Design an enzyme around this catalytic site. Structure first.
Site, mmCIF file in Angstrom:
data_model
loop_
_atom_site.group_PDB
_atom_site.id
_atom_site.type_symbol
_atom_site.label_atom_id
_atom_site.label_comp_id
_atom_site.label_asym_id
_atom_site.label_seq_id
_atom_site.Cartn_x
_atom_site.Cartn_y
_atom_site.Cartn_z
ATOM 1 N N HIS A 12 41.603 35.819 32.849
ATOM 2 C CA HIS A 12 40.728 36.277 33.935
ATOM 3 C C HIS A 12 39.282 35.783 34.077
ATOM 4 O O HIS A 12 38.685 35.997 35.110
ATOM 5 C CB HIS A 12 40.730 37.823 33.963
ATOM 6 C CG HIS A 12 42.105 38.427 33.950
ATOM 7 N ND1 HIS A 12 42.970 38.343 35.018
ATOM 8 C CD2 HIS A 12 42.778 39.087 32.980
ATOM 9 C CE1 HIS A 12 44.115 38.923 34.708
ATOM 10 N NE2 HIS A 12 44.021 39.382 33.476
ATOM 11 N N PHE A 120 43.075 43.466 33.314
ATOM 12 C CA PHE A 120 42.513 43.531 34.659
ATOM 13 C C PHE A 120 43.418 44.495 35.419
ATOM 14 O O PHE A 120 44.614 44.282 35.473
ATOM 15 C CB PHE A 120 42.524 42.137 35.308
ATOM 16 C CG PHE A 120 41.797 42.070 36.627
ATOM 17 C CD1 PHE A 120 40.427 41.813 36.662
ATOM 18 C CD2 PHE A 120 42.478 42.277 37.839
ATOM 19 C CE1 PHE A 120 39.733 41.764 37.884
ATOM 20 C CE2 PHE A 120 41.789 42.234 39.058
ATOM 21 C CZ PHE A 120 40.413 41.977 39.074
ATOM 22 N N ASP A 121 42.873 45.561 36.006
ATOM 23 C CA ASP A 121 43.737 46.517 36.687
ATOM 24 C C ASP A 121 43.848 46.306 38.174
ATOM 25 O O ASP A 121 44.942 46.253 38.693
ATOM 26 C CB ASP A 121 43.273 47.964 36.430
ATOM 27 C CG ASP A 121 44.399 48.954 36.498
ATOM 28 O OD1 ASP A 121 45.435 48.701 35.874
ATOM 29 O OD2 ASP A 121 44.269 49.995 37.161
#
Length: 124
Positions: A12, A120-121
């Site tokens: 990310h 990472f949501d």
């Protein structure tokens, strides 16, 4: 091995560019980051902010994670991110992606000591 924290950075973080450089961006990045080695990972988001800025999100707004856990945090400010999403021509091992830039709040799950981003949501 690879810690959860190092894995998050790999999948990310992209502080080199302030935005999705070009239509070619996702195709290059998904491969470069080894996200297209066992299958074509369907979606992935890259954050173009400093590591320190993203880690600081762990002390920001606490919100519920999509899986029901409570260790998720939403950034108070919008951040520069790029969404990588599969195209129809995408066929493993020839994965193809559509690059999309935007400025949104990110939501990440944090854990450990020190308390750092591990997943990472969502982005909103």
């Amino acid at each position: 091995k690879e810690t959860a924290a190092a894995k998050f950075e790999r999948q990310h973080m992209d502080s080199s560019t302030s935005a999705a450089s070009s239509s070619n961006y996702c195709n290059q990045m998904m491969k470069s980051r080894n996200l297209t080695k066992d299958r074509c990972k369907p979606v992935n988001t890259f954050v173009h902010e400093s590591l320190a800025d993203v880690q600081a999100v762990c002390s920001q707004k606490n919100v519920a994670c999509k899986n029901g856990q409570t260790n998720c945090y939403q950034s108070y400010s919008t951040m520069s991110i790029t969404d990588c999403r599969e195209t129809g021509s995408s066929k493993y091992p020839n994965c193809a992606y559509k690059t999309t830039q935007a400025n949104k709040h990110i939501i990440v799950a944090c854990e450990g000591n020190p308390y750092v981003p591990v997943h990472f949501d969502a982005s909103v």
